[PDB]
């Protein structure tokens, strides 16, 4: 019943052009074929070093919700059907990657074939996602190389940090000694990394390991001889173009809340790499800034296209 064309007409408003979008944002016409019940593997995000044994606790749209395997619903997420960060059961193993038992388990008691017969459940088919296994990984980015990236929750602070895992054609982030959970996963044209050396030559002041002895002498030189890790190659770094997103222009987004939900949006403000969202019809207590490339924006028509609810503005 509530359609976009005519919202158009009545606010005498324009919608983002899907040309604004990176492919794997706007695309409508994949089939999701997860169901109810299947076990795979994913990272955590709140701990994205780590993978877990997940299953499909609810299907909508291009949308799946997983759930943590003998973990409390409160950890439960959703994601695209179109993920990077979900695999199928077996993965971890042919990638060298380490694998979290469910709650209850221990690693040296786990085996797919068994787990799965223990609870009756199928593993979701490796077709069925639009990754696998076979992608060639990021050029010049490899687990171990140091650089220098900003801290997405402080960002005025770019720290030391390292690769810690590669995956296809992204990489994981790590800030040197600090918690895992400001961790995040980036492809060589983040404009979140830079070069080892990078802060200096701009004349911003760098963030040091946590803890590093005498921290106001952090020597660049010094800290890679101790560790005999190398920089990312300066080669490597391929920082993206700024978005092209306008300010009133309007599109779909995931609501931050109630992750469930996705909403009739509109650009409320924009900066080189991020756009402000507001709500139609919502308080502007609520607007948000999320980066052009987030799997949870997408122009209109993708929740029609794709057989997700849409809510329409608030009244």
Not at 38 to 66: N, W
Not at 98 to 126: D, H, I, N, V
Request: proline share 9%; net charge negative; aromatic share 14%.
């Amino acid at each position: 019943s509530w359609s976009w064309e005519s919202y158009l007409e009545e606010q005498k408003a324009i919608t983002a052009p899907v040309s604004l979008f990176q492919d794997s944002q706007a695309v409508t016409h994949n089939k999701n074929g997860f169901k109810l019940g299947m076990k795979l593997e994913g990272i955590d995000p709140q701990h994205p070093s780590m993978y877990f044994i997940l299953t499909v606790a609810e299907v909508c749209g291009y949308r799946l919700r997983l759930h943590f395997d003998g973990y409390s619903e409160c950890h439960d997420f959703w994601v695209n059907a179109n993920s990077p960060d979900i695999h199928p059961a077996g993965w971890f193993e042919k990638t060298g990657h380490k694998l979290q038992p469910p709650k209850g388990y221990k690693e040296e008691e786990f085996s797919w074939s068994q787990y799965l017969r223990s609870t009756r459940a199928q593993a979701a088919p490796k077709h069925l996602f639009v990754s696998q296994s076979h992608s060639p990984p990021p050029l010049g980015f490899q687990v171990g190389m140091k650089l220098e990236a900003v801290n997405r929750m402080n960002p005025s602070l770019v720290c030391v940090a390292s690769v810690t895992d590669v995956v296809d054609s992204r990489f994981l982030v790590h800030f040197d000694n600090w918690d895992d959970t400001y961790d995040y996963w980036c492809d060589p044209s983040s404009p979140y990394i830079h070069p080892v050396g990078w802060c200096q030559k701009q004349g911003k002041p760098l963030t040091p390991p946590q803890d590093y002895p005498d921290p106001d002498n952090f020597c660049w030189e010094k800290y890679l001889e101790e560790t005999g890790a190398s920089a990312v190659p300066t080669w490597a770094f391929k920082v993206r173009p700024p978005h092209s997103f306008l300010v009133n222009m309007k599109l779909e987004a995931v609501d931050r809340r109630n992750p469930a939900l996705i909403r009739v949006a509109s650009v409320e403000d924009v900066e080189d790499h991020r756009i402000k969202i507001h709500f139609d019809g919502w308080s502007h207590g609520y607007d948000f800034w999320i980066d052009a490339d987030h799997p949870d924006i997408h122009p209109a028509g993708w929740c029609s296209k794709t057989g997700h609810p849409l809510q329409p503005p608030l009244g």
